[PDB]
Amino acid sequence: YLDRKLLTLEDKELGNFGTVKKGYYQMKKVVKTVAVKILKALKDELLAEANVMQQLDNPYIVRMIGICEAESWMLVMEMAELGPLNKYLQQNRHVKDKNIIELVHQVSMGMKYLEESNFVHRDLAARNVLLVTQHYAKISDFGLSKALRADENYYKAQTHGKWPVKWYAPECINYYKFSSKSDVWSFGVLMWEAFSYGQKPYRGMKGSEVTAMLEKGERMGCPAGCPREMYDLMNLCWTYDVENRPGFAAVELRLRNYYYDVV
Ligand SMILES: Cc1ccc(Nc2nc(N[C@@H]3CCOC[C@@H]3N)ncc2C(N)=O)cc1
Secondary structure, three states: OOOHHHEEEEEEEOOOOEEEEEEEEEEOOEEEEEEEEEEOOHHHHHHHHHHHHHOOOOOOEOOEEEEEEOOOEEEEEEOOOOEEHHHHHHHOOOOOHHHHHHHHHHHHHHHHHHHHOOEEOOOOOHHHEEEEEOOEEEEOOOOOOEEOOOOOOOEEOOOOOOOOHHHOOHHHHHHOEEOHHHHHHHHHHHHHHHHOOOOOOOOOOOHHHHHHHHHOOOOOOOOOOOOHHHHHHHHHHOOOOHHHOOOHHHHHHHHHHHHHHOO
């Protein structure tokens, strides 16, 4: 646990869990710049999110510093100063396609780690990818994440809150089953987002209309300027049948070979 007197918070909001604030945390002889999730049943969720983060250790996943019991419960994390990927790309339209390939490949490496560790993320979107630099992305926001049982390859949802339906695979919507393959679908949407410079997917559509469109075999179009091979990978990620859709090992390898082949 973290001592509250060693933590200082700026009061400007960076971002229903509550708010995210920037702060500084004195660690031995220095200060560390931190991002802090502040709580506005809900106590258990933050401590659950912290318990998932504590278990993960990978260069493409945000590192948690610790939790802080003070005026409210707080999850203290290493600050990713460039912020959410979607917003960055909205404000930086000059970013080159090789640079976007590099960043989504990094997300796929982090997700391959998550899949090996038998964790489902359940909220994989461009808003939950954080940029440490313009060439270094990290996955964050493990508020819906679950550690799968040793003998199971999906989490069965009981709790039916407000879901990020536009990022969810058909099996999550129709049967409430969330697997790593379900995260691969989300990853496809994240890729569409990245090459669309942070535009919202399925613009102006209700979740129910998105579900109808997908059942017809329809999918989002190729974003302007997107390499063909990356649009193709998006379509593979959006394979309707779970057994036919690739896992993250296959997805990361495809991105890795394509990225390394760029001249
Ligand atoms: C503008 C800005 C800069 C840094 C961050 N940092 C983080 N944000 C989150 N969560 C956010 C919740 C609101 O929606 C956007 C984000 N998903 N989580 C972790 C960090 C971090 N460790 O830096 C947010 C906004």
